[PDB]
Amino acid sequence: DGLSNLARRLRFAMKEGSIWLGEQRMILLHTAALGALRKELVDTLGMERARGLFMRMGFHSGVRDAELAKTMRSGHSDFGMLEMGPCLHTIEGVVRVTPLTVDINIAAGVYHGEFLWEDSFEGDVHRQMFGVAQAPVCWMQIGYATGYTSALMGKTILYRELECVGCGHPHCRILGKPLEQWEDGEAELALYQP
């Protein structure tokens, strides 16, 4: 339902060498090319700084997709709106998202959400350039979730991967909740600032 409905917002305007998702102009980019940039940033600026750059990039993506979701608001419950994030992330070929348990009420500022990530392009590309890492690696993907749901909730919602293929697990798994639920919350919120 969501996928096939949000997918109609994706448009290819070749007369103008352009691709549009709702109101945001998009490009098709090779994962290997974005992987090479990551290798460069990590090799020179260091892993933890490269991780902030990517999380932040993903954040900005997430916020934009939330604004598109807001326009198609009417007729959707709070879960329906939230769902659109996982849907656009999947359409964008970033990851296959399966929403498991989602507790949301925007009016009350309620949010607790856990999702499954399959075929994460990011974990799958960090490994090709860096082998297995001893910490979750889908930086840009976590950034997106955080930005989207934060835009949607109108308060800081932070996400973390509980499991990542970049660490050598069968899947990535993530959890998102208010900044008051996270033990290292202020340290996590810091990463999203230039």
Ligand X SMILES: Cc1cc(C)cc(O)c1
The site for a copy of itself (CB under 8 A) is made up of: 3, 7, 10, 12, 14-19, 21, 24-34, 36-37, 40-41, 43, 45, 53-54, 56-58, 60-61, 64-65, 89-97, 118-121, 124, 194
Tell me which residues in 148-187 interact with Zn ion (CB under 5 A).
161, 164, 172
Q: Give how far the C-alpha of residue 53 lies from the chain's centroid of Cα atoms, to the nearest Å.
A: 14
Nearest approach in angstroms of CB 48 to a copy of itself is 14
Complex with Zn ion: residue 61 or 120, whichever CB lies closer: 120
Nearest approach in angstroms of CB 96 to a copy of itself is 3
Complex with Zn ion: residue 157 or 164, whichever CB lies closer: 164
Measured torsion, CA atoms of residues 13, 76, 3, 10, in degrees rounded to the nearest 10: 10
Neighbours of 61 (CB within 10 A): 22
- φ/ψ of 83, rounded to 5, equals -55, -30
87 is in an annotated binding site: no
Complex with a copy of itself: residue 64 or 177, whichever CB lies closer: 64
Q: Which residue has the tokens 């993903």?
A: 58
**Closest C-alpha among 119, 111, 92 to residue 175:** 111
- φ/ψ of 25, rounded to 5, equals -75, 135
Binding-site residue positions for Zn(2+): 138, 161, 164, 172
